[PDB]
Amino acid sequence: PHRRFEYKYSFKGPHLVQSDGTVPFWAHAGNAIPSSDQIRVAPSLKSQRGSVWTKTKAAFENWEVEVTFRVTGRGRIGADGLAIWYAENQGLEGPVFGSADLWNGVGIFFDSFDNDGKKNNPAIVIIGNNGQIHYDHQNDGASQALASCQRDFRNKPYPVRAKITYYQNTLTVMINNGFTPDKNDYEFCAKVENMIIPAQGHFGISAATGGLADDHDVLSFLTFQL
């Protein structure tokens, strides 16, 4: 299938922020710091919340996003993690990885912190929501987990990349794990079959920290119409 770049739902360096400290077409918020080559969505500080969400909503049936980030801390343990969103409402502030709960769509959580004590972290995790669910934070949402995988994205030597395709009611998540700089050396993580989401709405990205804290930097967010 053909792809079309959608600048209005994307960002990237080398000149990512405007003079006035704003990212074009995106609303950043809380403790998110945009900068010339990346947004530190949440810094390695206690109890951070930050999020960046598209201003305009977006109407495409099928799409893809490639998202490039680093998550970094001294410990082999870190927190809390990162979250890519497609959904209906801008969910800027809120308890779900910096962002709003009761969300209407999909959220792909890069859970650094093993919150249900299970040793199942760090892990990537897909979660549906129609406007009335409460994300089971303490249980990583292991119960609401449409699907998931166990890939380690912390402290890698190349920025990690996540291709997230929604093609014909099949969402799929590929992952370069920052071991190679081959920006198209994706490994299969997971996949959700037979899944609807709002016809329109925003893309966003968010993250957060608590007692433990990594830096959460996103370098780019490229979005495509299929």
């Binding site: 053909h2 079309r4 770049f5 600048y7 209005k8 960002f11 000149h15 405007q18 003079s19 495509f224």
Partner: protein
């Protein structure tokens, strides 16, 4: 001319997209958007969201 195709191909792909043009131009977002949308409408024949050198001339 090619010198100018390249001034703002920062990612190096030999393709300009909306974000690379935004910077070319950098005023309000909507003002900006209108200009970028103009360029794509005007130049982006194959509608991939990029403009190659052919589309540029």
């Amino acid at each position: 001319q090619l010198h100018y195709f390249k001034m703002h191909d920062y990612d190096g792909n030999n393709l300009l997209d909306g974000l690379e043009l935004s910077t070319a131009i950098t005023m309000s977002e909507d003002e900006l958007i209108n200009i970028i949308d103009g360029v794509l409408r005007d130049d982006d024949k194959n509608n991939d969201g990029y403009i190659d050198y052919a589309e540029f001339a």
